[PDB]
Write a protein that holds these residues in place. Structure first.
Motif, PDB file in Angstrom:
ATOM      1  N   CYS A 187       0.849  -1.227   0.000  1.00 22.10           N
ATOM      2  CA  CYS A 187       0.000   0.000   0.000  1.00 22.10           C
ATOM      3  C   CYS A 187       0.872   1.260   0.000  1.00 22.10           C
ATOM      4  O   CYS A 187       1.804   1.382   0.774  1.00 22.10           O
ATOM      5  CB  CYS A 187      -0.822  -0.075   1.288  1.00 22.10           C
ATOM      6  SG  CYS A 187      -1.672   1.501   1.546  1.00 22.10           S
ATOM      7  N   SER A 188       0.565   2.201  -0.855  1.00 19.18           N
ATOM      8  CA  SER A 188       1.359   3.465  -0.905  1.00 19.18           C
ATOM      9  C   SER A 188       0.666   4.539  -0.058  1.00 19.18           C
ATOM     10  O   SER A 188      -0.515   4.779  -0.221  1.00 19.18           O
ATOM     11  CB  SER A 188       1.381   3.872  -2.382  1.00 19.18           C
ATOM     12  OG  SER A 188       1.815   2.770  -3.170  1.00 19.18           O
ATOM     13  N   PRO A 189       1.419   5.150   0.825  1.00 21.42           N
ATOM     14  CA  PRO A 189       0.855   6.209   1.706  1.00 21.42           C
ATOM     15  C   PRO A 189       0.556   7.489   0.906  1.00 21.42           C
ATOM     16  O   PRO A 189      -0.243   8.310   1.318  1.00 21.42           O
ATOM     17  CB  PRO A 189       1.962   6.449   2.730  1.00 21.42           C
ATOM     18  CG  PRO A 189       3.221   6.019   2.046  1.00 21.42           C
ATOM     19  CD  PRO A 189       2.846   4.921   1.086  1.00 21.42           C
ATOM     20  N   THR A 190       1.190   7.664  -0.230  1.00 17.56           N
ATOM     21  CA  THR A 190       0.944   8.888  -1.054  1.00 17.56           C
ATOM     22  C   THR A 190      -0.240   8.672  -2.009  1.00 17.56           C
ATOM     23  O   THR A 190      -0.918   9.610  -2.384  1.00 17.56           O
ATOM     24  CB  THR A 190       2.241   9.099  -1.849  1.00 17.56           C
ATOM     25  OG1 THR A 190       3.338   9.202  -0.949  1.00 17.56           O
ATOM     26  CG2 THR A 190       2.137  10.384  -2.674  1.00 17.56           C
ATOM     27  N   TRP A 191      -0.484   7.449  -2.411  1.00 18.31           N
ATOM     28  CA  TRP A 191      -1.619   7.173  -3.355  1.00 18.31           C
ATOM     29  C   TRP A 191      -2.774   6.448  -2.642  1.00 18.31           C
ATOM     30  O   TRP A 191      -3.865   6.351  -3.171  1.00 18.31           O
ATOM     31  CB  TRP A 191      -1.019   6.284  -4.447  1.00 18.31           C
ATOM     32  CG  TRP A 191       0.211   6.922  -5.021  1.00 18.31           C
ATOM     33  CD1 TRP A 191       0.362   8.243  -5.274  1.00 18.31           C
ATOM     34  CD2 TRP A 191       1.460   6.285  -5.418  1.00 18.31           C
ATOM     35  NE1 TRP A 191       1.626   8.455  -5.792  1.00 18.31           N
ATOM     36  CE2 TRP A 191       2.339   7.279  -5.904  1.00 18.31           C
ATOM     37  CE3 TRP A 191       1.908   4.953  -5.402  1.00 18.31           C
ATOM     38  CZ2 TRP A 191       3.620   6.964  -6.358  1.00 18.31           C
ATOM     39  CZ3 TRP A 191       3.196   4.631  -5.858  1.00 18.31           C
ATOM     40  CH2 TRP A 191       4.050   5.635  -6.335  1.00 18.31           C
ATOM     41  N   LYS A 192      -2.541   5.948  -1.448  1.00 17.64           N
ATOM     42  CA  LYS A 192      -3.611   5.238  -0.672  1.00 17.64           C
ATOM     43  C   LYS A 192      -4.118   3.974  -1.398  1.00 17.64           C
ATOM     44  O   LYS A 192      -5.252   3.572  -1.216  1.00 17.64           O
ATOM     45  CB  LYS A 192      -4.742   6.264  -0.501  1.00 17.64           C
ATOM     46  CG  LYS A 192      -4.776   6.754   0.949  1.00 17.64           C
ATOM     47  CD  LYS A 192      -3.449   7.441   1.296  1.00 17.64           C
ATOM     48  CE  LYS A 192      -3.708   8.613   2.247  1.00 17.64           C
ATOM     49  NZ  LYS A 192      -3.904   7.993   3.589  1.00 17.64           N
ATOM     50  N   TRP A 193      -3.289   3.323  -2.185  1.00 17.44           N
ATOM     51  CA  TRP A 193      -3.746   2.069  -2.869  1.00 17.44           C
ATOM     52  C   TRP A 193      -2.660   0.984  -2.796  1.00 17.44           C
ATOM     53  O   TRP A 193      -1.547   1.237  -2.376  1.00 17.44           O
ATOM     54  CB  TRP A 193      -4.082   2.450  -4.327  1.00 17.44           C
ATOM     55  CG  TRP A 193      -2.880   2.929  -5.096  1.00 17.44           C
ATOM     56  CD1 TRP A 193      -1.650   2.355  -5.094  1.00 17.44           C
ATOM     57  CD2 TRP A 193      -2.796   4.056  -6.015  1.00 17.44           C
ATOM     58  NE1 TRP A 193      -0.822   3.071  -5.938  1.00 17.44           N
ATOM     59  CE2 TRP A 193      -1.482   4.126  -6.530  1.00 17.44           C
ATOM     60  CE3 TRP A 193      -3.727   5.021  -6.441  1.00 17.44           C
ATOM     61  CZ2 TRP A 193      -1.102   5.116  -7.437  1.00 17.44           C
ATOM     62  CZ3 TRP A 193      -3.350   6.019  -7.355  1.00 17.44           C
ATOM     63  CH2 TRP A 193      -2.040   6.066  -7.851  1.00 17.44           C
ATOM     64  N   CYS A 194      -2.982  -0.225  -3.190  1.00 17.20           N
ATOM     65  CA  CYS A 194      -1.980  -1.337  -3.136  1.00 17.20           C
ATOM     66  C   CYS A 194      -1.407  -1.612  -4.531  1.00 17.20           C
ATOM     67  O   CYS A 194      -2.135  -1.892  -5.464  1.00 17.20           O
ATOM     68  CB  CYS A 194      -2.762  -2.557  -2.635  1.00 17.20           C
ATOM     69  SG  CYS A 194      -2.613  -2.683  -0.835  1.00 17.20           S
ATOM     70  N   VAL A 195      -0.107  -1.549  -4.671  1.00 18.91           N
ATOM     71  CA  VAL A 195       0.533  -1.818  -6.001  1.00 18.91           C
ATOM     72  C   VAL A 195       1.715  -2.777  -5.825  1.00 18.91           C
ATOM     73  O   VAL A 195       2.012  -3.207  -4.729  1.00 18.91           O
ATOM     74  CB  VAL A 195       1.020  -0.458  -6.531  1.00 18.91           C
ATOM     75  CG1 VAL A 195      -0.146   0.284  -7.185  1.00 18.91           C
ATOM     76  CG2 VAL A 195       1.588   0.392  -5.387  1.00 18.91           C
ATOM     77  N   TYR A 196       2.392  -3.114  -6.896  1.00 21.66           N
ATOM     78  CA  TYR A 196       3.559  -4.048  -6.786  1.00 21.66           C
ATOM     79  C   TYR A 196       4.578  -3.512  -5.767  1.00 21.66           C
ATOM     80  O   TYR A 196       4.788  -2.317  -5.654  1.00 21.66           O
ATOM     81  CB  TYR A 196       4.165  -4.114  -8.199  1.00 21.66           C
ATOM     82  CG  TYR A 196       4.917  -2.838  -8.513  1.00 21.66           C
ATOM     83  CD1 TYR A 196       4.227  -1.711  -8.978  1.00 21.66           C
ATOM     84  CD2 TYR A 196       6.306  -2.783  -8.339  1.00 21.66           C
ATOM     85  CE1 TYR A 196       4.923  -0.532  -9.268  1.00 21.66           C
ATOM     86  CE2 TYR A 196       7.002  -1.604  -8.629  1.00 21.66           C
ATOM     87  CZ  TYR A 196       6.311  -0.480  -9.093  1.00 21.66           C
ATOM     88  OH  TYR A 196       6.997   0.683  -9.379  1.00 21.66           O
ATOM     89  N   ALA A 197       5.202  -4.388  -5.019  1.00 23.17           N
ATOM     90  CA  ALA A 197       6.199  -3.931  -4.001  1.00 23.17           C
ATOM     91  C   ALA A 197       7.603  -3.871  -4.616  1.00 23.17           C
ATOM     92  O   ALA A 197       7.986  -4.720  -5.400  1.00 23.17           O
ATOM     93  CB  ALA A 197       6.145  -4.978  -2.886  1.00 23.17           C
ATOM     94  N   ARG A 198       8.373  -2.871  -4.260  1.00 22.35           N
ATOM     95  CA  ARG A 198       9.756  -2.746  -4.815  1.00 22.35           C
ATOM     96  C   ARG A 198      10.675  -2.057  -3.792  1.00 22.35           C
ATOM     97  O   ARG A 198      10.847  -0.851  -3.824  1.00 22.35           O
ATOM     98  CB  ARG A 198       9.602  -1.889  -6.077  1.00 22.35           C
ATOM     99  CG  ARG A 198      10.927  -1.855  -6.842  1.00 22.35           C
ATOM    100  CD  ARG A 198      10.960  -2.994  -7.865  1.00 22.35           C
ATOM    101  NE  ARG A 198      11.857  -2.512  -8.954  1.00 22.35           N
ATOM    102  CZ  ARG A 198      11.381  -2.318 -10.157  1.00 22.35           C
ATOM    103  NH1 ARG A 198      10.893  -3.324 -10.836  1.00 22.35           N
ATOM    104  NH2 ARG A 198      11.395  -1.119 -10.680  1.00 22.35           N
ATOM    105  N   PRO A 199      11.238  -2.851  -2.913  1.00 16.47           N
ATOM    106  CA  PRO A 199      12.149  -2.312  -1.869  1.00 16.47           C
ATOM    107  C   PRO A 199      13.506  -1.918  -2.476  1.00 16.47           C
ATOM    108  O   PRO A 199      14.126  -1.012  -1.942  1.00 16.47           O
ATOM    109  CB  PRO A 199      12.304  -3.476  -0.893  1.00 16.47           C
ATOM    110  CG  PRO A 199      12.028  -4.703  -1.701  1.00 16.47           C
ATOM    111  CD  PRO A 199      11.081  -4.308  -2.806  1.00 16.47           C
TER     112      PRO A 199
END
Length: 34
Positions: free
Chosen positions: A22-34
């Motif tokens: 989940c992205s705190p700037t977009w408020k949605w869940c997308v692919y993860a990339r650490p």
């Protein structure tokens, strides 16, 4: 529950389905990339 690919998350600690993040700037869940 299970949300992925621009899925509605709403929460910097909300967990997506699997492999997503989940992205705190977009408020949605997308692919993860650490």
């Amino acid at each position: 529950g299970c949300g992925g690919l621009m899925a509605g998350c709403d929460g910097k600690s909300t967990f997506c389905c699997s492999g997503y993040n989940c992205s705190p700037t977009w408020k949605w869940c997308v692919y993860a990339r650490p």
